[PDB]
From Swiss-Prot, chain B:
Gene of this entry: fliC
Compartment annotation: Secreted; Bacterial flagellum
Protein name stated in the entry: Flagellin
Domain of life per record: Bacteria
Chain coiled-coil ranges: none
Section covered of the full-length record: 51 to 100 of 498
Family classification: Belongs to the bacterial flagellin family.
Species: Escherichia coli (strain K12)
Function, as annotated: Flagellin is the subunit protein which polymerizes to form the filaments of bacterial flagella.
From Swiss-Prot, chain D:
Protein's name in the database: Flagellin
Range covered out of full length: 450 to 498 of 498
Record family assignment: Belongs to the bacterial flagellin family.
Subcellular location(s) of the protein: Secreted; Bacterial flagellum
Function: Flagellin is the subunit protein which polymerizes to form the filaments of bacterial flagella.
């Protein structure tokens, strides 16, 4: 019945934070127009 | 529980520190991209000059 | 005035030098602006 | 004259393609900007309940 920890909320926040990166990547790709917009993406594709 | 609290605080601070490395990497990557563009234009100029 | 066309040619080259330097400075400043924008966003 | 034409003039097909590409990029990016600006709203829902 514990209210000093609401672990369900922690799981939900973890999932939202996980989705955040994908959402940001999708927006960045849509705005820029290039799938390799940084070295973190491929960087072998970036070098070539 | 005291040890658990210490570990939780340390790990949260560690993630906060980790974000800084990503920030530094992004800044340096942007600067390097600008250097890349300058080098590409220099190469084009040399191809024109030779 | 002796050798007039040579005088005109060197004058034209001398103004072209200044124009080219000015354009190079323009490109310099534009690249600086873009890098500053990226750095500001990251900060 | 032919050499100067090959040096200073622009190729209209390429320029039209570049203009179209830039216009589409601008419109798409601005729509995504509108979506990103609409993003922060759910905190209000969290606060209200």
């Amino acid at each position: 019945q514990v209210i000093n920890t609401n672990s369900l909320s922690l799981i939900t926040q973890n999932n939202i934070n996980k989705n955040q990166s994908a959402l940001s990547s999708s927006i960045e790709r849509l705005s820029s127009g290039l799938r390799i917009n940084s070295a973190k993406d491929d960087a072998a594709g970036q070098a070539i | 529980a005291n040890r658990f609290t210490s570990n939780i605080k340390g790990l949260t601070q560690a993630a906060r520190n980790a974000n800084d490395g990503i920030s530094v990497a992004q800044t340096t990557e942007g600067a390097l991209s600008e250097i890349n563009n300058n080098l590409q234009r220099v190469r084009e100029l040399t191809v024109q000059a030779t | 005035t002796t050798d007039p066309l040579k005088a005109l040619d060197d004058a034209i080259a001398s103004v072209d030098k200044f124009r080219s330097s000015l354009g190079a400075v323009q490109n310099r400043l534009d690249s600086a602006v873009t890098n500053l924008n990226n750095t500001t966003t990251n900060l | 004259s032919e050499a100067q034409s090959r040096i200073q003039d622009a190729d209209y097909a390429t320029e039209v393609s570049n203009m179209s590409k830039a216009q589409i990029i601008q419109q798409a990016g601005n729509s995504v900007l509108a979506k990103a600006n609409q993003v922060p709203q759910q905190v209000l829902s969290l606060l209200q309940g």
